[PDB]
Amino acid sequence: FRVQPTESIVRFPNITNLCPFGEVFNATRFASVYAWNRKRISNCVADYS
Amino acid sequence: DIQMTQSPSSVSASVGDRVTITCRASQGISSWLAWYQQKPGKAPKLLIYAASSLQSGVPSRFSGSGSGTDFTLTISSLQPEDFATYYCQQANSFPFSFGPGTKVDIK
Amino acid sequence: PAYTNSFTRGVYYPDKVFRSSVLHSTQDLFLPFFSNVTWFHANPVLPFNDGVYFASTEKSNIIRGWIFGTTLDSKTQSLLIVNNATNVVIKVCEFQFCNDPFLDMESGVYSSANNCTFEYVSQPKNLREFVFKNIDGYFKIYSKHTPINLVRDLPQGFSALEPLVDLPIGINITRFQTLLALHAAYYVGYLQPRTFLLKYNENGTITDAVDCALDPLSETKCTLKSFTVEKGIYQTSN
Amino acid sequence: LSFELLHAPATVCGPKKDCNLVKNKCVNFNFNGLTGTGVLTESNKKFLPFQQFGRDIADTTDAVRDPQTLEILDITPCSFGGVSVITPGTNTSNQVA
Ligand SMILES: *[C@@H]1O[C@H](CO)[C@@H](O[C@@H]2O[C@H](CO)[C@@H](O)[C@H](O)[C@H]2NC(C)=O)[C@H](O)[C@H]1NC(C)=O
């Protein structure tokens, strides 16, 4: 006699410091093509969903 | 969120004087600013935009100046109908914030 | 220089496992019991042979960081672990330095401003003990603050060093030197693979350990997996 | 969006989703990389701050610290065993226990 597992759970530390893409894709004023602006996003948790 | 903290609270002057109104910001609104004239009992009107420009119709005595964080509006030939309050609306960040106001009186 | 003997000092937690009333035996890098450790009193550059045991009894804050590297130049990184009055900075940067570097801004950062990679700020009468090792691209630091008073040599007792933080630098390190606040006694000891018999109490804190290679009695203790043995003859090794 | 790879460790890396914590039921668990099957229950064990999970004498994991909330959970394997049929013999009756 053996009982089988019913669910599967996963636990990971709190997701913190999400990457600041919100400013890049939502900024009110973008730049003209000749002066394309470069933003080095670093040290962050990025979700592309 | 950017707040307008223009320094002159009120300026006392008369006809044929010189009045400078300095507007202060908190981030990079370098070239996105407008000025408005608010006569009591009526809606405001635009006279200066982009921190350096002249609206089609306004006389050639109100001049905008300044770029970056500080912004100054100067008048050299003050006229009685110009006596009102002035606001420096921003245009950089989308939630635009108006100014406090600056009353000018008859003295 | 001067030679002093470390009497059962330099035992840290080899892993983050909680064990209660278990006489665990582990194989890792430990400072051998009753081994001579060089005494310094001034501070030249030192090699990094798989690990170093740093102990300083200075009551002031003159000792305020360390540097690491193998062929330190502007092309290779270096470990800047200086200790400020309120914080620390972990500056792994591709820099070199002139002779006699220290902190009074730093005396070594005059030319140490080249191609820096990663930064971190974690850490802000008694003895400071530190163990440094760099394995599989991970740099591990163990520290303990034990109150010692009116004793010349290292105190006779047991103290387990707890880890502070592991950093993924992934660079080569061969030379080691401290950054003395030049505006001075500290001990150095080296770690080589040894077999230890850690004894965890009911709270998970290590209380005593046995060096399995010091003398035959210790090897007998390690074989029986106990800290006490009874009358008889025991076969231990070959 | 221009990504780039280098020998240095990655600083921008994807998130790890989590499921809500359940207890008193035999469920597969993945606590920060620890994989196993058992029943999770609240524990009174006292962990040192750096220690993350516990092991028994036989080097079998028994206690794990939840990552999101710093609490200790006891791992107990869910019940198993054998089944035995007690009979008085088919020559007398077919009723069994
Ligand atoms: C991880 O995130 C959870 C979710 O907010 C945190 O849980 C809260 O923590 C605060 C801090 O004490 C409590 O006041 C709340 O009551 C908690 N809420 C829940 C639902 O648990 C948790 O503290 C975070 N952990 C870390 C280490 O940051």
Swiss-Prot record, chain A:
Note the SS bond partners. Answer: C19-C44
Give the residue ranges for region: Disordered: 2-18
Residues with glycosylation annotation: T6, S8, N14, N26
Q: Per the record, what is the consequence of mutating G22D?
A: In strain: Omicron/BA.1, Omicron/BA.2, Omicron/BA.2.12.1, Omicron/BA.4, Omicron/BA.5, Omicron/BQ.1.1
Top-rank taxon, per record = Viruses
The consequence of R29K is: In strain: Mu/B.1.621
> So what does this one do?
Attaches the virion to the cell membrane by interacting with host receptor, initiating the infection. The major receptor is host ACE2. When S2/S2' has been cleaved, binding to the receptor triggers direct fusion at the cell membrane. When S2/S2' has not been cleaved, binding to the receptor results in internalization of the virus by endocytosis using host TFRC and GRM2 and leading to fusion of the virion membrane with the host endosomal membrane. Alternatively, may use NRP1/NRP2 and integrin as entry receptors.
Q: How does it assemble?
A: Binds to host ACE2. RBD also interacts with the N-linked glycan on 'Asn-90' of ACE2. Cleavage of S generates a polybasic C-terminal sequence on S1 that binds to host Neuropilin-1 (NRP1) and Neuropilin-2 (NRP2) receptors. Interacts with host integrin alpha-5/beta-1 (ITGA5:ITGB1) and with ACE2 in complex with integrin alpha-5/beta-1 (ITGA5:ITGB1). May interact via cytoplasmic c-terminus with M protein. May interact (via N-terminus) with host bilirubin and biliverdin, thereby preventing antibody binding to the SARS-CoV-2 spike NTD via an allosteric mechanism.
Record-given protein name? Spike protein S1
Curated annotation (Swiss-Prot), chain C:
Q: Which residues form the BetaCoV S1-NTD domain?
A: 1-224
> Changing P1S: reported impact?
In strain: Gamma/P.1
Disulphide linkage map: C93-C116, C212-C222
The listed outcome for V151G is: In strain: Omicron/BA.2, Omicron/BA.2.12.1, Omicron/BA.2.75, Omicron/BA.4, Omicron/BA.5, Omicron/BQ.1.1
Annotated region (Putative superantigen), positions in chain: 201-222
Q: Which domain of life, per UniProt?
A: Viruses
Which residue positions carry a glycan here?
A: N36, N84, N115, N172, N203
Look up what happens after changing R128K: Partial loss of biliverdin affinity
Q: How does it assemble?
A: Binds to host ACE2. RBD also interacts with the N-linked glycan on 'Asn-90' of ACE2. Cleavage of S generates a polybasic C-terminal sequence on S1 that binds to host Neuropilin-1 (NRP1) and Neuropilin-2 (NRP2) receptors. Interacts with host integrin alpha-5/beta-1 (ITGA5:ITGB1) and with ACE2 in complex with integrin alpha-5/beta-1 (ITGA5:ITGB1). May interact via cytoplasmic c-terminus with M protein. May interact (via N-terminus) with host bilirubin and biliverdin, thereby preventing antibody binding to the SARS-CoV-2 spike NTD via an allosteric mechanism.
- Say what the protein does: Attaches the virion to the cell membrane by interacting with host receptor, initiating the infection. The major receptor is host ACE2. When S2/S2' has been cleaved, binding to the receptor triggers direct fusion at the cell membrane. When S2/S2' has not been cleaved, binding to the receptor results in internalization of the virus by endocytosis using host TFRC and GRM2 and leading to fusion of the virion membrane with the host endosomal membrane. Alternatively, may use NRP1/NRP2 and integrin as entry receptors.
Task: State what protein this is by name.
Answer: Spike protein S1
User: From which source organism is this entry?
Assistant: Severe acute respiratory syndrome coronavirus 2 (2019-nCoV)
Source species taxonomy? Viruses, Riboviria, Orthornavirae, Pisuviricota, Pisoniviricetes
Q: Which gene encodes it?
A: S
Q: Which residues of the full protein are shown?
A: 26 to 317 of 1273
